[PDB]
Amino acid sequence: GSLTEDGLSYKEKFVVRSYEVGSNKTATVETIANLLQEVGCNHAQSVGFATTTTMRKLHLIWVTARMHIEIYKYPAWGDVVEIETWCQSEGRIGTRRDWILKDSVTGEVTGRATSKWVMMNQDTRRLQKVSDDVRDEYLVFCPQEPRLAFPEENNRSLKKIPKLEDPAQYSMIGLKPRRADLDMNQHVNNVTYIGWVLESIPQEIVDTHELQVITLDYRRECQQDDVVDSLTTTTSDSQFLHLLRLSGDGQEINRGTTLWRKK
Amino acid sequence: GSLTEDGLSYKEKFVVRSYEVGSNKTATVETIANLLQEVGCNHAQSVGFATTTTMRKLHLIWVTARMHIEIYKYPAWGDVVEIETWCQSEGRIGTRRDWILKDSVTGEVTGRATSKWVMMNQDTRRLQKVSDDVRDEYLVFCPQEPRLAFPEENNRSLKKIPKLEDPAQYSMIGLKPRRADLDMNQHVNNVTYIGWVLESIPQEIVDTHELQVITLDYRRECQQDDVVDSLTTTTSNDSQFLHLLRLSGDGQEINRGTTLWRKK
Numbered sequence: 412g413s414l415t416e417d418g419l420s421y422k423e424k425f426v427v428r429s430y431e432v433g434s435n436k437t438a439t440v441e442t443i444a445n446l447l448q449e450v451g452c453n454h455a456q457s458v459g460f461a462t463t464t465t466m467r468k469l470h471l472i473w474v475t476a477r478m479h480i481e482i483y484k485y486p487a488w489g490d491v492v493e494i495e496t497w498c499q500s501e502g503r504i505g506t507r508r509d510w511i512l513k514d515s516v517t518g519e520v521t522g523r524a525t526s527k528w529v530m531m532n533q534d535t536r537r538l539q540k541v542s543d544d545v546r547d548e549y550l551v552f553c554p555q556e557p558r559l560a561f562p563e564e565n566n567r568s569l570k571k572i573p574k575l576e577d578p579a580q581y582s583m584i585g586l587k588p589r590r591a592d593l594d595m596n597q598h599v600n601n602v603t604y605i606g607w608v609l610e611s612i613p614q615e616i617v618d619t620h621e622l623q624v625i626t627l628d629y630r631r632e633c634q635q636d637d638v639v640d641s642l643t644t645t646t647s648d649s650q651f652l653h654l655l656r657l658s659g660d661g662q663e664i665n666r667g668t669t670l671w672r673k674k
Numbered sequence: 675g676s677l678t679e680d681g682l683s684y685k686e687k688f689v690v691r692s693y694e695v696g697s698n699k700t701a702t703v704e705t706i707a708n709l710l711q712e713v714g715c716n717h718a719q720s721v722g723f724a725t726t727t728t729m730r731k732l733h734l735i736w737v738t739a740r741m742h743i744e745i746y747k748y749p750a751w752g753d754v755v756e757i758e759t760w761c762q763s764e765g766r767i768g769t770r771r772d773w774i775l776k777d778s779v780t781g782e783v784t785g786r787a788t789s790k791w792v793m794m795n796q797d798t799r800r801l802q803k804v805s806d807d808v809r810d811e812y813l814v815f816c817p818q819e820p821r822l823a824f825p826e827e828n829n830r831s832l833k834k835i836p837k838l839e840d841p842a843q844y845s846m847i848g849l850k851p852r853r854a855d856l857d858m859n860q861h862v863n864n865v866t867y868i869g870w871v872l873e874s875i876p877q878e879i880v881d882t883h884e885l886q887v888i889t890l891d892y893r894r895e896c897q898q899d900d901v902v903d904s905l906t907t908t909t910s911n912d913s914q915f916l917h918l919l920r921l922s923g924d925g926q927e928i929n930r931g932t933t934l935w936r937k938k
């Protein structure tokens with residue numbers, strides 16, 4: 412791909428692969444989430460990055476706090492999808508990365524995503540506000556006027572998510588990451604949590620419904636030697652409340668909501 | 675990609691992605707195996723397929739019996755890899771698909787693969803020899819003279835694999851497939867078995883060695899509701915292992931294999 416003419420956003424085209432599609436021969440939400448991750452990485456590399464020069468010496472990293480994806484049409488196997496991505500400063504709270512998914516042939520928006528990132532010390536795992544020294548290093552790569560993939564005042568991407576009460580209606584227990592679930596730094600890839608959340612959705616729902624919206628809050632990281640329980644309860648179109656927690660102590664790692672539409 | 679000038683092989687270029695690399699910032703063997711699978715699919719689509727018209731009528735499918743991969747250099751993140759693939763008839767035994775991996779910049783062969791496919795009834799799971807009616811439908815898309823990715827007279831792609839004896843030196847217990855491990859037909863993707871085999875290799879070996887060769891025999895398919903046990907034993911500068919995947923319950927064999935690793 413490449414940066415746009417103003418250098419304030421990045422675009423990339425992807426051809427949907429055979430192993431990237433589900434039973435309906437269209438890209439899975441995990442394939443979509445991997446593509447957003449890839450275009451985000453290519454945007455950082457194209458402008459020299461993410462971690463700025465100040466973040467590196469201070470052992471600071473950007474970590475995902477919240478992910479929100481809305482899909483209107485899942486691209487078919489062999490189709491070309493164009494993804495446009497950009498970043499925006501959210502003051503001292505952190506940063507935001509947005510995405511727009513379009514069909515390469517028709518030019519219509521087939522999906523959109525937004526994510527909230529927060530600064531964290533790599534070693535102590537302690538959150539912190541964005542300093543001016545850090546802010547000045549990345550602002551020159553962001554639009555200065557607001558540019559939101561989800562502009563709607565009071566919309567699905569900023570709603571509070573409650574904690575699922577025991578007993579859960581559905582559950583998938585004993586989930587463990589394998590080496591394919593780890594990134595280049597040996598941490599569990601954020602897309603694996605989406606897959607784990609979806610494992611407790613019954614197969615009948617997956618077979619008769621399509622996933623329209625998914626919102627995920629990231630509370631704690633899952634280590635390579637950790638075991639996760641996936642819990643789901645219907646709250647309703649079908650809506651579900653989700654919870655990932657450690658198999659042992661029951662420590663929360665994620666919470667989320669999904670909205671599905673009848674095929 | 676596209677078929678070559680003679681239409682007897684297919685080539686495709688891939689840029690290695692961020693989430694496709696391991697700790698060394700190079701493509702994993704599972705990424706490589708997915709790319710071979712994708713180029714094989716695009717080859718069949720480009721010539722009108724890989725079930726023929728007769729195979730669809732008789733509920734017959736091509737299933738993998740053996741996979742053999744040898745990697746000399748794993749492509750780095752952001753690198754372009756070119757993969758050339760072709761098929762060859764192995765008489766009435768079945769078919770073979772071979773691959774050649776090359777660096778797009780240097781043009782050098784960085785890896786190669788071969789696989790044995792056998793005809794099976796989709797419903798009864800019963801193997802069968804390739805009939806003349808089926809053979810004539812795909813022969814016109816194959817080279818007639820032999821073209822082997824592993825030509826050597828004493829190559830490791832045709833060696834017999836023994837069954838691992840209990841107790842195993844290493845093991846990874848309770849492995850279950852998730853929805854991302856399934857293909858478009860809701861069957862476990864063949865690349866998941868490679869990942870499962872590698873889960874019983876200790877992390878220290880993965881951190882100090884690079885995987886050079888992997889040979890896998892496919893004996894039985896793992897269902898979506900099955901649980902697998904991965905067993906490994908060292909048999910050996912270079913390290914060799916004997917592998918076995920079996921069902922967690924009854925201990926029914928699903929796969930057996932061997933891996934060869936070299937010191938980084």
Ligand SMILES: CS(=O)(=O)NC1CCCC1
Nearest residue numbers: 454455461498506549552
């Ligand atoms: C514009 S960018 O996403 O490539 N760079 C990042 C912005 C937040 C910190 C670095």
Ligand SMILES: CS(=O)(=O)NC1CCCC1
Nearest residue numbers: 718723724761769812815
């Ligand atoms: C050209 S191809 O790879 O699609 N040929 C195949 C041989 C087995 C059946 C199809």
